[PDB]
Design a protein around this motif. Structure first.
Motif, short mmCIF file in Angstrom:
data_model
loop_
_atom_site.label_atom_id
_atom_site.label_comp_id
_atom_site.label_asym_id
_atom_site.label_seq_id
_atom_site.Cartn_x
_atom_site.Cartn_y
_atom_site.Cartn_z
N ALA A 25 0.64 -1.18 -0.05
CA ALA A 25 0.08 0.05 -0.01
C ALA A 25 0.87 1.42 -0.01
O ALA A 25 0.34 2.19 -0.64
N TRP A 26 2.13 1.27 0.50
CA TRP A 26 3.08 2.49 0.72
C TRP A 26 3.02 3.24 -0.69
O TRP A 26 3.10 4.66 -0.59
N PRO A 27 3.27 2.77 -1.76
CA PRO A 27 3.27 3.54 -2.90
C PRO A 27 2.01 4.56 -3.32
O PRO A 27 2.26 5.31 -4.22
N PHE A 28 1.08 4.11 -2.75
CA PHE A 28 -0.21 4.73 -2.87
C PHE A 28 -0.64 5.83 -1.76
O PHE A 28 -1.65 6.30 -1.91
N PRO A 31 0.69 11.39 -3.42
CA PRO A 31 0.96 11.34 -4.98
C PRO A 31 2.25 10.96 -5.60
O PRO A 31 3.27 11.13 -4.77
N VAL A 32 2.36 10.57 -6.65
CA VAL A 32 3.67 10.19 -7.22
C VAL A 32 4.34 11.36 -7.44
O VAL A 32 3.88 12.51 -7.94
N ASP A 33 5.59 11.60 -6.95
CA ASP A 33 6.62 12.65 -7.01
C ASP A 33 7.18 12.37 -8.32
O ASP A 33 8.58 12.14 -8.33
N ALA A 34 6.51 12.81 -9.52
CA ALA A 34 7.26 12.76 -10.81
C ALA A 34 8.59 13.23 -11.01
O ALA A 34 9.53 12.85 -11.70
N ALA A 36 10.83 14.63 -8.56
CA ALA A 36 12.09 13.94 -7.73
C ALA A 36 12.33 12.31 -8.33
O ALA A 36 13.54 12.22 -8.51
N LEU A 37 11.36 11.63 -9.01
CA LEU A 37 11.76 10.49 -9.34
C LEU A 37 12.13 10.43 -11.08
O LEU A 37 12.63 9.34 -11.37
N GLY A 38 12.07 11.62 -11.77
CA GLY A 38 12.73 11.85 -13.07
C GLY A 38 11.51 11.19 -14.03
O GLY A 38 11.92 10.84 -14.97
N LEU A 39 10.26 10.98 -13.45
CA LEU A 39 9.22 10.67 -14.53
C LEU A 39 8.59 11.78 -15.26
O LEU A 39 7.46 12.40 -14.97
N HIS A 40 9.68 12.20 -16.47
CA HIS A 40 9.27 13.45 -16.96
C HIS A 40 7.95 13.35 -17.93
O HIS A 40 7.32 14.52 -18.10
N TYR A 84 0.34 3.79 -16.57
CA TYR A 84 1.80 4.41 -16.51
C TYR A 84 2.71 3.31 -16.70
O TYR A 84 3.71 3.28 -17.68
N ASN A 85 2.86 2.41 -16.07
CA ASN A 85 3.99 1.44 -15.78
C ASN A 85 3.95 0.18 -16.67
O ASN A 85 2.81 -0.55 -16.92
N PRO A 86 5.11 -0.43 -16.87
CA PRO A 86 5.15 -1.78 -17.71
C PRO A 86 4.56 -2.68 -16.73
O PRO A 86 4.93 -2.73 -15.46
N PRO A 87 4.05 -3.88 -17.05
CA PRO A 87 3.54 -4.84 -16.48
C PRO A 87 4.60 -5.67 -15.16
O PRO A 87 3.98 -5.88 -14.42
N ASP A 88 5.73 -5.54 -15.59
CA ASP A 88 6.60 -6.46 -14.77
C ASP A 88 7.05 -5.62 -13.48
O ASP A 88 7.65 -6.18 -12.69
N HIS A 89 6.76 -4.06 -13.70
CA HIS A 89 7.18 -3.19 -12.59
C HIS A 89 6.68 -3.83 -11.31
O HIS A 89 5.53 -4.29 -10.88
N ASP A 90 7.61 -3.67 -9.86
CA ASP A 90 7.01 -3.85 -8.71
C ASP A 90 5.89 -3.29 -8.33
O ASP A 90 4.89 -3.82 -7.44
N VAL A 91 5.46 -1.92 -8.63
CA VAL A 91 4.65 -1.18 -8.37
C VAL A 91 3.19 -2.12 -8.89
O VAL A 91 2.13 -1.61 -8.09
N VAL A 92 3.29 -2.36 -10.01
CA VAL A 92 2.18 -2.91 -10.54
C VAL A 92 1.42 -4.08 -9.87
O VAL A 92 0.45 -4.35 -9.54
C1 LIG Z 1 8.08 3.23 -15.10
C2 LIG Z 1 8.62 3.76 -14.11
N1 LIG Z 1 7.86 3.72 -12.98
C3 LIG Z 1 8.10 4.37 -12.00
O1 LIG Z 1 9.39 4.67 -11.45
C4 LIG Z 1 7.23 4.53 -10.76
C5 LIG Z 1 7.19 4.74 -9.50
C6 LIG Z 1 6.06 4.77 -8.93
C7 LIG Z 1 5.79 5.13 -7.44
C8 LIG Z 1 6.64 5.43 -6.48
C9 LIG Z 1 6.53 6.67 -5.82
C10 LIG Z 1 7.39 6.65 -4.89
S1 LIG Z 1 7.37 8.39 -4.11
O2 LIG Z 1 8.72 8.86 -3.50
O3 LIG Z 1 6.79 9.39 -4.94
C11 LIG Z 1 6.44 8.27 -2.69
C12 LIG Z 1 6.66 7.01 -1.96
C13 LIG Z 1 8.70 6.10 -4.75
C14 LIG Z 1 8.67 5.02 -5.33
C15 LIG Z 1 7.79 4.59 -6.34
O4 LIG Z 1 7.77 3.48 -6.81
C16 LIG Z 1 8.83 2.34 -6.58
C17 LIG Z 1 8.32 1.45 -5.93
C18 LIG Z 1 6.78 1.31 -5.47
C19 LIG Z 1 9.15 0.41 -5.61
C20 LIG Z 1 10.32 0.40 -6.29
C21 LIG Z 1 10.88 1.21 -6.81
C22 LIG Z 1 10.09 2.41 -7.22
C23 LIG Z 1 10.88 3.66 -7.94
C24 LIG Z 1 4.44 5.12 -7.22
N2 LIG Z 1 3.44 4.85 -8.17
C25 LIG Z 1 2.19 5.12 -7.77
C26 LIG Z 1 3.73 4.51 -9.58
O5 LIG Z 1 2.88 4.37 -10.40
C27 LIG Z 1 5.09 4.49 -9.68
N3 LIG Z 1 5.87 4.49 -11.04
#
Ligand SMILES: CCNC(=O)c1cc2c(-c3cc(S(=O)(=O)CC)ccc3Oc3c(C)cccc3C)cn(C)c(=O)c2[nH]1
Length: 110
Positions: A25-28, A31-34, A36-40, A84-92
């Protein structure tokens, strides 16, 4: 009734924010910090960002008219993640786990 439905929605949200689900639940929570994360391209792909802190506000301020409005926001948050994310990503995988919890609790609502 509508007021009874929203009281149950408060319990669902409490459950999604509870410590038992924190591992997925923590990634939710916020809001996603686009930036800071470089998700342009995040705000170009996701037109309506959504997260549990926004759902928590709309619940506290009674912005949801019914359970369906609450469910639309929660599902929008998961849909944004799948979009937004590829299906294999940990967040999915984390979103699917949390959505199974939401769908179960929402379906079991009396
Ligand atoms: C294709 C590329 N996608 C992304 O890098 C991407 C990232 C995220 C995050 C997300 C938000 C934060 S945060 O610092 O903003 C607050 C906590 C930090 C990590 C986050 O994700 C990760 C997770 C959950 C695990 C491991 C690594 C990462 C980068 C949230 N969500 C909801 C997304 O959809 C999404 N996508």
């Amino acid at each position: 009734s509508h007021m009874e439905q929203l009281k149950h929605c408060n319990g669902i949200l409490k459950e999604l924010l509870s410590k038992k689900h924190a591992a997925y639940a923590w990634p939710f929570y916020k809001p996603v910090d686009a930036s800071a994360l470089g998700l342009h391209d995040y705000h170009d792909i996701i037109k309506h960002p959504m997260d549990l802190s926004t759902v928590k506000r709309k619940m506290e301020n009674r912005d949801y008219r019914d359970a369906q409005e609450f469910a639309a926001d929660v599902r929008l948050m998961f849909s944004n993640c799948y979009k937004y994310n590829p299906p294999d990503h940990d967040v999915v995988a984390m979103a699917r786990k949390l959505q199974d919890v939401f769908e179960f609790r929402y379906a079991k609502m009396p």
